[PDB]
Write a protein that binds this ligand. Structure first.
Ligand code: 78M
Ligand code: 78M
Ligand code: 78M
Ligand code: 78M
Ligand code: 78M
Ligand code: 78M
Ligand code: 78M
Ligand code: 78M
Ligand code: 78M
Ligand code: 78M
Ligand code: 78M
Ligand code: 78M
Ligand code: 78M
Ligand code: 78M
Ligand code: 78M
Ligand code: 78M
Ligand code: 78M
Ligand code: 78M
Ligand code: 78M
Ligand code: 78M
Ligand code: 78M
Ligand code: PHE
Length: 448
């Protein structure tokens, strides 16, 4: 009987749905930094390029922090399938905002819409993939691997299409393509879902009991009130610049796992929770480096590379391209390698060392040739080749979204240090540091 690569046919609907959402997200991000550079260049947007880079990082951080509660809201309040649909709608609207004939004034509205939308859609589209399978089913992990391939499929073709469109017909048109991408995702999702998805997930699977409603409301109200109080105080004391607000979001993002871990810490349980701290840190630092590809490596692509024969935003395709290219091998690897299939911590250790190697490699062209000229595109190609080796090793949903969010929050401060005069030191020191405490994670690995 017909399947989608051996899997239930529903996977095809969810495959394409996420491929097109990821298309809209990554197509937009492959030109967003350049768009801000452009807005700065015309005097419309009053920030430094450093701050612009910082915005890209905290933006990514908020997008995944939002997903850490998206699952809850679907499971307990609105249902997984409506979460994805209305999430998709909010994302489309976010891209439409940028297609409108506005400038810097439209940036915030776009960002908020996409942050909220992605929080609803991403964890729940992934959750729905699981719903295709009985828990007894063995295909389940193959199904997600296919799903992830779809994620990177969209991530791969989006910069090629949106970037080319930007150079040809301008930014607004290019952003409109992203919106259209999400629109296409919603169409397939809506009509394909009705044919192939369980109507069980039109509603929340664990709806709030009567006595649970008021305490939840109290809880979120106190969080919103406290957050609002801090912003009030910040303006009183004069800490009300954009970087001040970015610093606030950074702190909140990092305070969450810290606050979390610190007071969940019988004696044995205590330690095994403490056992996952270094692995959480490993994921955070790895995703820090991985997410810098769209910021620092994007900057390097635009400023330090001779690629005058194609849109520089196309370098953003190398990351998911390598994912797709590496997948057949690692499929072969994990089967064929049966004994000594290594510690989940070790996969984290090595994965971080590779990330560290990817940056160390980028320290070389400036050390050898200087930083005022331009170097071969192959440095970036080699750099992404290394960091994606790590990502192959690295692959609750919330925690996963959380490690990423903290990584990008860290980036929001780090990437402000990058410039052509810091380049070599920047790459070398953050590169070495990552290798070193990926090695430190080897000393500790089995001590765990
Ligand atoms: C106009 C404002 C738009 C609001 C959209 C921005 C939302 C960004 C982040 C959502 C904050 C939720 C806090 C996350 C949280 O509670 O912790 C995650 C939970 O998994 C703890 O492990
Ligand atoms: C229609 C309103 C859209 C803007 C807000 C979207 C709703 C976002 C958050 C609602 C708060 C729900 C509480 C989140 C929460 O407590 O998460 C608990 C955490 O354990 C998640 O696993
Ligand atoms: C300026 C804001 C524009 C917003 C316009 C968006 C209107 C979109 C759809 C109109 C109603 C269709 C309802 C479809 C729906 O509820 O989907 C439910 C979802 O669970 C599908 O699986
Ligand atoms: C407890 C609630 C957490 C709130 C999370 C914060 C979500 C709100 C905004 C996030 C936007 C990130 C920064 C976007 C930005 O600075 O762009 C605006 C600027 O370009 C306009 O001049
Ligand atoms: C990069 C140019 C586009 C060509 C991509 C190949 C055809 C595109 C989509 C159909 C294949 C999607 C399923 C991918 C797949 O079979 O997964 C392989 C491996 O991860 C096992 O799950
Ligand atoms: C169905 C809703 C999602 C699809 C969005 C539909 C977008 C369709 C057309 C958007 C046109 C955007 C380009 C308009 C524009 O400002 O171009 C700038 C031009 O004047 C300079 O080259
Ligand atoms: C400049 C563009 C116009 C701005 C508003 C565009 C609104 C476009 C689309 C609204 C949501 C489309 C959702 C697609 C879908 O499958 O919905 C089906 C549902 O309505 C059937 O009841
Ligand atoms: C799109 C909806 C997101 C809701 C944002 C969260 C609002 C803040 C606190 C939760 C208040 C309870 C709202 C959920 C609710 O109405 O529960 C009713 C139902 O689950 C049981 O009666
Ligand atoms: C729903 C959660 C609380 C949001 C209600 C109060 C909203 C006020 C501020 C939201 C914090 C976002 C920080 C980004 C921001 O405000 O941009 C800074 C801009 O004014 C630069 O001057
Ligand atoms: C008021 C104390 C409540 C608990 C602490 C919560 C976080 C406290 C301060 C965070 C404010 C944002 C980061 C600090 C800040 O604004 O930097 C100032 C500087 O950027 C202005 O140029
Ligand atoms: C008693 C609580 C456990 C021990 C306290 C741990 C501290 C808790 C939260 C601190 C947030 C991390 C600091 C955020 C950060 O590194 O950003 C620095 C920068 O944004 C400040 O301008
Ligand atoms: C997997 C193999 C790829 C290895 C690539 C990384 C190679 C190892 C170290 C490269 C470090 C280059 C440091 C050059 C340097 O920092 O000196 C430059 C300085 O003197 C001028 O600013
Ligand atoms: C799986 C481990 C990855 C193995 C990677 C091995 C790569 C070995 C060395 C890479 C260092 C960069 C070489 C420096 C270089 O070629 O510069 C010379 C070049 O500019 C041509 O004149
Ligand atoms: C696994 C082998 C990969 C080779 C990595 C070795 C690369 C080490 C350093 C980068 C090449 C030297 C760059 C030129 C250099 O640093 O000379 C010092 C110069 O900057 C002082 O003016
Ligand atoms: C996105 C992948 C990057 C493609 C890797 C290609 C790297 C190899 C060579 C790049 C530059 C040399 C070939 C292009 C070139 O400069 O030809 C000369 C031309 O610019 C004269 O106008
Ligand atoms: C499966 C392979 C993954 C690991 C590969 C590591 C790649 C290491 C280095 C690649 C880039 C360094 C070589 C750059 C290069 O070709 O020199 C530039 C030369 O064209 C002068 O313009
Ligand atoms: C058949 C096994 C495949 C595994 C290949 C592993 C080889 C690791 C890295 C290959 C990258 C090539 C290193 C680039 C280099 O050495 O610089 C080239 C330089 O000579 C150009 O002038
Ligand atoms: C429990 C997991 C914790 C996650 C560990 C990651 C947080 C550790 C350190 C974050 C400190 C970042 C401070 C960077 C900084 O302030 O310097 C950049 C500054 O110059 C920006 O202008
Ligand atoms: C004993 C364990 C050591 C393992 C670390 C292996 C790391 C491999 C290569 C590291 C190359 C170091 C690069 C030198 C460096 O960063 O200094 C130059 C830098 O300051 C440029 O401004
Ligand atoms: C355990 C995670 C640690 C992550 C945070 C580490 C960052 C610490 C300090 C950053 C600011 C001062 C360090 C400056 C630096 O490392 O690079 C040199 C500078 O020229 C360019 O970055
Ligand atoms: C400048 C050249 C430095 C070369 C560094 C060589 C590789 C880096 C460190 C040696 C490997 C770790 C050595 C200690 C060790 O094996 O730890 C004990 C065991 O528990 C391993 O987990
Ligand atoms: N490249 C990953 C980034 C990511 C990791 C973890 C959570 C969310 C996003 C993706 O698009 O899925």
């Amino acid at each position: 009987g017909k399947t989608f690569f051996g899997q239930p046919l529903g996977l095809s609907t969810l495959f394409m749905t996420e491929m097109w959402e990821r298309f809209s997200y990554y197509g937009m991000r492959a030109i967003l930094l350049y768009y801000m550079w452009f807005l700065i260049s015309t005097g419309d947007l009053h920030i430094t390029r450093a701050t612009a880079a910082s915005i890209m990082a905290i933006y990514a951080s908020m997008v995944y922090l939002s997903g850490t509660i998206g699952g809850f809201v679907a499971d307990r309040i609105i249902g997984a399938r409506p979460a994805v649909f209305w999430g998709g709608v909010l994302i489309m609207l976010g891209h439409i905002v940028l297609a409108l004939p506005f400038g810097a004034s439209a940036l915030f509205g776009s960002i908020i819409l996409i942050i909220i939308g992605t929080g609803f859609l991403k964890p729940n589209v992934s959750t729905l993939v699981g719903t295709l399978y009985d828990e007894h089913d063995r295909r389940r992990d193959a199904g997600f691997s296919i799903f992830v391939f779809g994620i990177n499929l969209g991530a791969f073709i989006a910069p090629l299409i949106v970037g080319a469109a930007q150079e040809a017909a301008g930014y607004h048109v290019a952003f409109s393509l992203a919106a259209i991408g999400m629109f296409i995702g919603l169409l397939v999702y809506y009509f394909g879902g009705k044919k192939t998805l369980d109507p069980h997930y039109l509603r929340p699977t664990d709806p709030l009991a009567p006595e649970e409603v008021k305490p939840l409301l109290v809880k979120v109200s106190l969080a919103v009130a406290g957050f609002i109080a801090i912003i009030v105080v910040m303006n009183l004391v004069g800490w009300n610049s954009l970087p001040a607000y970015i610093n606030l979001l950074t702190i909140v993002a990092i305070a969450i796992p810290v606050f979390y871990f610190a007071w969940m810490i019988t004696s044995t349980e205590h330690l095994r929770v403490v056992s996952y701290i270094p692995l959480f840190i490993a994921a955070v630092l790895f995703w820090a480096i991985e997410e810098q590809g769209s910021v620092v490596l994007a900057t390097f692509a635009a400023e330090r590379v001779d690629s005058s024969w194609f849109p520089v935003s196309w370098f953003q395709s190398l990351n998911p391209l390598f994912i797709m290219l590496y997948t057949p091998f690692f499929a072969w690897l994990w089967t064929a390698w049966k004994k000594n299939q290594p510690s989940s911590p070790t996969k984290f250790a090595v994965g971080l060392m590779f990330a560290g190697l990817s940056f160390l490699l980028m320290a070389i062209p400036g050390a050898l040739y200087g930083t005022s000229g331009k170097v071969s595109p192959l440095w970036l190609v080699g750099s992404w080749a290394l960091v994606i080796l790590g990502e192959m090793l690295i692959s609750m949903m919330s925690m996963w979204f959380l490690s990423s969010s903290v990584g990008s929050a860290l980036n929001a401060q780090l990437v402000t240090l990058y410039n052509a005069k810091s380049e070599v030191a920047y790459f070398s020191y953050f590169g070495l540091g990552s290798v070193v405490l990926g090695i430190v994670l080897v000393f500790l690995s089995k001590r765990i």
